Design an enzyme around this catalytic site. Structure first.
Site, PDB file in Angstrom:
ATOM      1  N   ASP A  35     -14.092  10.741 156.633  1.00 48.62           N
ATOM      2  CA  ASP A  35     -14.478  10.668 155.247  1.00 48.62           C
ATOM      3  C   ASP A  35     -14.264  11.965 154.668  1.00 48.62           C
ATOM      4  OD1 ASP A  35     -15.633  10.143 152.912  1.00 48.62           O
ATOM      5  OD2 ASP A  35     -17.581   9.873 153.472  1.00 48.62           O
ATOM      6  N   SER A 199      -5.079  16.484 138.843  1.00 50.98           N
ATOM      7  CA  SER A 199      -3.850  15.694 138.639  1.00 50.98           C
ATOM      8  C   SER A 199      -3.255  16.187 137.407  1.00 50.98           C
ATOM      9  CB  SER A 199      -3.964  14.231 138.747  1.00 50.98           C
ATOM     10  OG  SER A 199      -2.982  13.549 138.688  1.00 50.98           O
TER      11      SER A 199
END
Length: 330
Positions: A35, A199
């Protein structure tokens, strides 16, 4: 040193991935959920409340000659999906794919929430976010990666998750045969303890690319792609009959649909998520309403590039003095 381990979907939907981890001496192999959005290595154990164990493999520290109780240490964690666990702490030897760390903090669960109990395939979590998020008290502990880093050939790990197929976690090297083209690196902020990056935009299907900054985290422990409501609405508007269902808890779509791809930007580069990766199947057995793999982050407080996004790429988690993230197509 290096390590290399295969990671395997837990079910036919890729709801999560498990990777075998050796703990203790002799080795006890547990299947952990790696994770990158948390920083605790915790396991089902011989200390876990018996009614809360249902099919998981447990770590029994009394059977490990290298286990030592970390005196006075406790831990307690709550995850974004509402699940939680807590317990005490041992140090022991932990190996992943041939890479060994001695003195790793292994957090032994005394209590786990229902969602963990109900998932027989996950024996615990191995956190790979920054150690500043580790919950051990009163002395915070380091992640497996943080402990291994100085020994690694290069201070990196890579995630290569498969779509409906096994993939690979590598530590200490970049497998140049595992991706196509070049790896595009992008800046990371560690201010919130995550692999947080920006992004450069998105496209839906064959549509034009929208240049827009989307701050989010690369999170292997989250199944879906959570993005701003505007982006998510633009995606689902291209699927006939798709709608947001408050009763189901997100966007659903007719199982008869063909889903468009979704592209996200990494600098000037582009990662394409095929439409099929966005299908999470019937909302309930036999239903013709299917659950979407792109959902709104509104009210999470952060955008999350979870498995839906990451499995479309070869992803480099670069833990150099100034960390960065790399993405390549594959």
């Amino acid at each position: 040193s290096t390590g290399s381990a295969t990671t395997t979907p837990i079910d036919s939907l890729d709801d999560a991935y498990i990777t075998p981890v050796q703990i203790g001496t002799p080795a006890q192999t547990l299947n952990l959920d790696f994770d990158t959005g948390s920083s605790d290595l915790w396991v089902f154990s011989s200390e876990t409340t018996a009614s809360e164990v249902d099919g998981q493999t447990i770590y029994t520290p009394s059977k490990s000659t290298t286990a030592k109780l970390l005196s006075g240490a406790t831990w307690s964690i709550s995850y974004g999906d509402g699940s939680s666990s807590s317990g005490d702490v041992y140090t022991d030897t932990v190996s992943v794919g041939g890479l060994t760390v001695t003195g790793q903090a292994v957090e032994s669960a005394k209590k786990v929430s229902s969602s963990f109990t109900e998932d027989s395939t996950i024996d615990g979590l191995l956190g790979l976010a920054f150690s500043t998020l580790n919950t051990v008290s009163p002395t915070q502990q380091k992640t497996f990666f943080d402990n291994a880093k100085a020994s690694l050939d290069s201070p990196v790990f890579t995630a290569d998750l498969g779509y409906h197929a096994p993939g690979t976690y590598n530590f200490g090297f970049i497998d140049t045969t595992a991706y196509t083209g070049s790896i595009t690196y992008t800046a990371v902020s560690t201010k919130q303890g995550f692999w947080e990056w920006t992004s450069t935009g998105y496209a839906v299907g064959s549509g034009t690319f929208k240049s827009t900054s989307i701050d989010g985290i690369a999170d292997t422990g989250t199944t879906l792609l959570y993005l701003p409501a505007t982006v998510v609405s633009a995606y689902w508007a291209q699927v006939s009959g798709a709608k947001s269902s408050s009763s189901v808890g997100g966007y659903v779509f007719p199982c008869s649909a063909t889903l468009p791809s979704f592209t996200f930007g990494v600098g000037s580069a582009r990662i394409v998520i095929p439409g099929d990766y966005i299908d999470f199947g019937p909302i309930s057995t036999g239903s013709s309403s299917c659950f979407g793999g792109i959902q709104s982050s509104a009210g999470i407080g952060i955008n999350i590039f979870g498995d839906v996004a990451l499995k479309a790429a070869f992803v480099v988690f670069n833990g150099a003095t100034t960390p960065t993230l790399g993405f390549a197509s594959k």
